[PDB]
Amino acid sequence: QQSMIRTTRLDYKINMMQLQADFKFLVVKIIDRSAFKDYNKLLASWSPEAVTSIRGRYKKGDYLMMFRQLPAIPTIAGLELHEILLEDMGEFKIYPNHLLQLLLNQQSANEKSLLEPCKTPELLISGEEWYREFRDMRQQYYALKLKVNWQQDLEMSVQTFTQVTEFQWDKQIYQFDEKRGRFQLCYQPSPGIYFVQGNHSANRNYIDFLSLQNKSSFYKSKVGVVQLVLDNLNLNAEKYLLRPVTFHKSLVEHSSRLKLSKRETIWQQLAGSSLNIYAQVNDRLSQELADQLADHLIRSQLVRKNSVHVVRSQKIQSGFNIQVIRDVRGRAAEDGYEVAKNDQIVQHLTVENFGHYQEGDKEITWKPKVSGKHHDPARDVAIVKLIQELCIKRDLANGKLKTVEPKLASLTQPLEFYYFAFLKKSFDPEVMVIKLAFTPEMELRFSKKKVRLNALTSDDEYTQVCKRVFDSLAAPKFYSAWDSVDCVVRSGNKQLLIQRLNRTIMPDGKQIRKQLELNRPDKTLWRDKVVEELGELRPMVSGDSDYVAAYEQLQALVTGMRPSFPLKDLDEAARKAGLNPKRRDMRQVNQFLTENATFTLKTTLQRELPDSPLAGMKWIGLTRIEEGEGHFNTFYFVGSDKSLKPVVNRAVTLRRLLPLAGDAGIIDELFPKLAAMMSVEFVRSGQYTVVPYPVKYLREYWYSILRQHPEYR
DNA sequence: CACTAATAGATTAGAGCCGTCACGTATCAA
DNA sequence: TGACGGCTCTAATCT
DNA sequence: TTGATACGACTGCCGAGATTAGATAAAGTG
Numbered sequence: 194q195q196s197m198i199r200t201t202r203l204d205y206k207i208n209m210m211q212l213q214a215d216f217k218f219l220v221v222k223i224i225d226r227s228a229f230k231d232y233n234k235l236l237a238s239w240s241p242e243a244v245t246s247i248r249g250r251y252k253k254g255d256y257l258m259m260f261r262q263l264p265a266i267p268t269i270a271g272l273e274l275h276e277i278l279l280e281d282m283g284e285f286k287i288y289p290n291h292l293l294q295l296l297l298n299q300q301s302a303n304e305k306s307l308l309e310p311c312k313t314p315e316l317l318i319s320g321e322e323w324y325r326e327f328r329d330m331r332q333q334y335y336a337l338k339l340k341v342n343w344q345q346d347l348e349m350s351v352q353t354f355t356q357v358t359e360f361q362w363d364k365q366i367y368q369f370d371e372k373r374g375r376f377q378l379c380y381q382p383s384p385g386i387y388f389v390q391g392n393h394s395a396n397r398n399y400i401d402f403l404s405l406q407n408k409s410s411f412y413k414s415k416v417g418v419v420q421l422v423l424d425n426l427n428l429n430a431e432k433y434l435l436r437p438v439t440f441h442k443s444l445v446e447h448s449s450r451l452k453l454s455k456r457e458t459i460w461q462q463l464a465g466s467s468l469n470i471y472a473q474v475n476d477r478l479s480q481e482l483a484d485q486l487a488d489h490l491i492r493s494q495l496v497r498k499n500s501v502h503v504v505r506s507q508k509i510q511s512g513f514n515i516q517v518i519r520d521v522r523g524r525a526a527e528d529g530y531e532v533a534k535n536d537q538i539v540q541h542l543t544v545e546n547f548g549h550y551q552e553g554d555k556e557i558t559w560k561p562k563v564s565g566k567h568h569d570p571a572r573d574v575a576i577v578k579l580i581q582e583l584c585i586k587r588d589l590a591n592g593k594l595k596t597v598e599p600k601l602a603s604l605t606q607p608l609e610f611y612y613f614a615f616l617k618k619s620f621d622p623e624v625m626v627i628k629l630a631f632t633p634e635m636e637l638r639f640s641k642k643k644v645r646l647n648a649l650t651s652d653d654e655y656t657q658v659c660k661r662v663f664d665s666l667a668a669p670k671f672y673s674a675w676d677s678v679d680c681v682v683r684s685g686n687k688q689l690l691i692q693r694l695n696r697t698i699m700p701d702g703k704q705i706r707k708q709l710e711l712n713r714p715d716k717t718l719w720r721d722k723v724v725e726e727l728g729e730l731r732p733m734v735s736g737d738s739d740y741v742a743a744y745e746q747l748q749a750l751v752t753g754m755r756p757s758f759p760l761k762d763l764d765e766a767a768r769k770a771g772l773n774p775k776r777r778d779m780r781q782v783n784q785f786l787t788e789n790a791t792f793t794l795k796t797t798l799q800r801e802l803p804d805s806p807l808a809g810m811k812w813i814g815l816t817r818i819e820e821g822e823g824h825f826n827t828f829y830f831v832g833s834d835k836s837l838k839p840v841v842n843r844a845v846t847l848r849r850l851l852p853l854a855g856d857a858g859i860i861d862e863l864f865p866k867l868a869a870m871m872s873v874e875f876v877r878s879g880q881y882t883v884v885p886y887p888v889k890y891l892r893e894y895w896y897s898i899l900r901q902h903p904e905y906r
Numbered sequence: 907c908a909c910t911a912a913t914a915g916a917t918t919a920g921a922g923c924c925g926t927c928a929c930g931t932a933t934c935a936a
Numbered sequence: 937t938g939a940c941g942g943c944t945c946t947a948a949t950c951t
Numbered sequence: 952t953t954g955a956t957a958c959g960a961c962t963g964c965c966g967a968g969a970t971t972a973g974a975t976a977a978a979g980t981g
């Protein structure tokens with residue numbers, strides 16, 4: 194099969210002539226910063242259809258006004274207002290993307306909506322679900338800001354709004370339009386409750402990416418809200434777009450579905466070794482946690498099966514060493530953090546974060562997650578991660594590569610990985626270029642060199658690689674640019690650049706909406722209509738004995754209930770009759786109903802299917818986005834190996850594969866190796882790692898240097 | 907008994923967060 | 937100092 | 952006779968109106 198994935202990039206073509214015929218456009222220059230008040234007064238006076246913000250590095254405008262009927266253009270000092278034509282829209286650097294922004298700004302969150310005029314430059318969507326109150330009854334919504342950037346990528350960033358009682362003439366004031374379910378700018382004092390951007394409370398606000406619990410829950414997520422808005426826009430503004438707004442479709446090239454290992458198989462490296470559990474002296478709170486953890490580890494079957502000796506001493510011994518300390522990083526206190534010596538491997542854990550101690554408790558309350566067939570305390574994710582970090586620190590200190598299996602190490606040896614860190618607190622722009630090389634004996638060969646961006650004419654390998662990365666980066670002046678780049682994998686003269694981006698993977702939201710509509714619980718059904726439909730669909734079943742038997746049982750079950758019923762009644766009747774969706778026969782019936790019937794008891798979303806709408810969120814693959822004409826930009830994604838849970842909190846970002854040196858075949862020949870390195874368990878607990886695993890070694894090695902060189906911290 | 911007065915945005919850049927490290931159950935291979 | 941990694945507020949940059 | 956691999960993880964209801972007698976109970980001045 195061929196998997197299809199769609200990113201945040203949009204495909205659309207605005208029907209320019211119809212838009213020009215139905216509207217008049219105005220461009221507002223703002224020269225004087227004090228003239229913002231006059232501009233706000235003008236906006237309060239007028240009533241435009243939509244407003245977007247033209248702003249570029251070569252400024253020829255500051256706002257675009259979409260007017261159904263152009264008003265009398267006035268003359269105000271500090272503003273230049275002049276009606277333009279869409280054929281001359283290139284004169285003010287108005288690309289065919291602020292027009293889609295206007296049409297987006299006219300939209301609404303509600304299903305089956307129309308083009309309602311609006312004056313807010315940005316589309317901020319918030320309902321009643323994304324709302325909470327404080328002890329001062331400060332209403333604090335948080336919306337979902339939608340915006341199409343200069344490269345036609347949709348951004349869905351979360352915007353949080355707080356409540357203010359009185360109008361602020363110097364700050365921006367926002368008012369919640371409850372009917373349209375979206376925030377709006379307030380230019381004049383208005384009845385209602387005012388809002389301002391910001392979130393100063395302790396807890397953050399996260400909007401779920403997508404949820405498959407049901408259609409109602411799906412509509413209150415990033416993907417669901419985006420789908421609602423896109424479908425609305427594709428419907429009400431049918432004339433204005435020659436082609437509908439759809440996310441750009443792309444083909445996966447190198448799909449990798451390597452299964453991970455059980456997280457608790459890391460104790461094999463610890464076989465026939467010792468763990469010296471000890472804590473910070475004269476601190477009872479850490480001592481009891483250390484004692485409890487040591488006792489759990491001793492009694493654990495996995496520890497006792499692998500022949501691992503766990504002892505609770507009072508000081509650091511040779512070999513592995515887990516330390517328990519009070520976190521004194523923030524305020525002033527004695528530093529219980531002990532730095533490891535020559536042959537000692539230390540891995541500290543605090544009490545506040547690891548032991549889950551909030552300020553006030555008299556004693557520890559840490560309880561390892563022992564869920565499973567037989568309860569075992571050496572299987573918790575935190576303990577496994579501690580052991581994995583101990584194994585990695587052992588590799589770093591010993592200089593040998595021994596925690597990566599023996600077959601993956603052979604495939605990784607002939608490749609060299611560079612690491613970059615923009616050296617802050619340096620007058621001259623300087624970057625530290627680390628380089629990890631592997632000897633044929635699987636030995637680490639870290640070797641760095643400080644490189645100045647001004648003096649890039651040197652001919653060493655570090656200077657060459659830094660110069661090549663320097664050219665590719667958009668804004669090398671800042672440090673976030675150098676933070677975006679992960680590593681530069683090198684194979685001889687070939688060099689490949691891995692860089693993080695902001696474009697994420699979007700699932701096929703339309704198909705998810707269509708299926709969840711079929712599986713909608715409160716969907717009323719007609720007994721006669723459903724019976725007739727199932728009778729007509731009977732010939733198409735043609736499966737095995739149990740499948741057809743379950744289909745006939747469901748067909749005969751429908752007649753039992755009342756002439757009309759919600760789908761929940763049918764679902765409960767099937768469940769009581771023994772049609773558990775987990776069964777093999779009922780699953781095929783559910784799939785058949787999803788593909789062909791107007792209803793389905795269970796939806797085949799979490800199932801692994803040849804063409805799933807959840808493509809790109811589950812496996813590792815490589816994509817080739819056009820990004821214009823002939824550049825053939827290459828990207829890849831990393832998804833969760835396990836089956837997706839009903840909710841997915843975070844999207845999956847797209848890294849970039851830019852060949853600094855060599856031809857285009859560098860990607861096609863090195864990507865399988867990178868994917869093989871990315872299928873590891875120690876770097877990321879229970880998941881794939883987005884970047885190759887030697888990036889973890891480089892990051893740990895650089896942190897070790899930072900521990901001794903405050904000049905680079 | 908008393909107020910008047912009369913008020914940068916927009917867009918990135920980064921520190922630091924949470925939150926996810928999957929679990930109990932039917933089910934085909936070996 | 938479980939740690940990775942997306943990403944959210946917020947100080948910074950930029951007129 | 953058990954060690955895999957693919958998928959389940961279920962939230963309720965949804966106002967108006969009309970009739971009584973019932974110790975109490977502080978601390979003020981423009």
Ligand SMILES: [Mg+2]
Pocket residue numbers: 582
């Ligand atoms: Mg660490």
